[model samples]
Target: ARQENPCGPCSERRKHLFVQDPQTCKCSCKNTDSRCKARQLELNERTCRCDKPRR
Candidate 1:
């Protein structure tokens, strides 16, 4: 099994650590522009976001 880093570089920089299932290595962001969502979706492919404000 591959070692997964769910939080990736930002968490790495903060010295936080995480382990995730490869199948569950997904991300989501809310209230993001379509361009940003498209870019993120392009990169992760499995990631998704809710099109609503964070409040």
Candidate 2:
């Protein structure tokens, strides 16, 4: 079970999140643990985050 933020907001880093057009975004649960896949995974554009799941 590995869950890394993959956090970033750049071109290459953009891959971390699941961008929904503009003004909306969230973490990419793809290839992630079932926990993340089952969670809301919603993020705050102000600061992209998965509601602070855990380490």
Candidate 3:
């Protein structure tokens, strides 16, 4: 089989929380409008995780 992209295609349901990195073939978290719905929480683009805003 051809070298398959490990990142896979982004799904509509998970698009808010995940994205496929075409260059690296890796799945990483990307920010979306609905991400970090909590008032005090925010999405860390580098790590793809939710965290409190920097003080």
Candidate 4:
């Protein structure tokens, strides 16, 4: 379990995680085409929502 980043935007809140086993980090939008390509972000099971619409 991780805490949400209050300072971050609503779409970016709790969107990524730092894992120990992999010795690296992963974002919650990894599999999402919209978020990955447009926003240049990644996603995973942790995040509750998808990427936001471009401004």
Worst lDDT run of 10 residues, candidate 1, spans 41-50
C-alpha root-mean-square deviation, each candidate: 10.5, 13.2, 6.6, 10.4
Q: What is the C-alpha lDDT of each candidate?
A: 0.37, 0.44, 0.60, 0.41
lDDT of 3 at 14: 43
Comparison by lDDT, 1 against 3, better one? 3
The residue pairs found clashing in candidate 1 are: none
Give a tens-digit lDDT track for model 1, residues 5-30.
44343223332222333455443433
lDDT of 2 by residue, 1-55 (tens): 3664444544355555444333233344333444443684444443344454444
Q: Where does candidate 4 clash, by residue pair?
A: 28-42, 28-43, 28-44, 29-42, 29-43, 30-42, 30-43
Q: What is candidate 2's local distance difference test score?
A: 0.44
Clashing pairs in 3: none
Among the numbered candidates, top TM-score falls to 3
| Tens-digit lDDT track of model 3 for 1-55 | 4876455555544455676776675665666324665656766665556687655
- Residue 22 error, candidate 4, Å: 36
Model 3: CA > 4 A from native:
1-18, 21-33
- Candidate no. 1 TM-score: 0.18
| CA deviation > 4 Å runs, candidate 2 | 1-38, 52-55
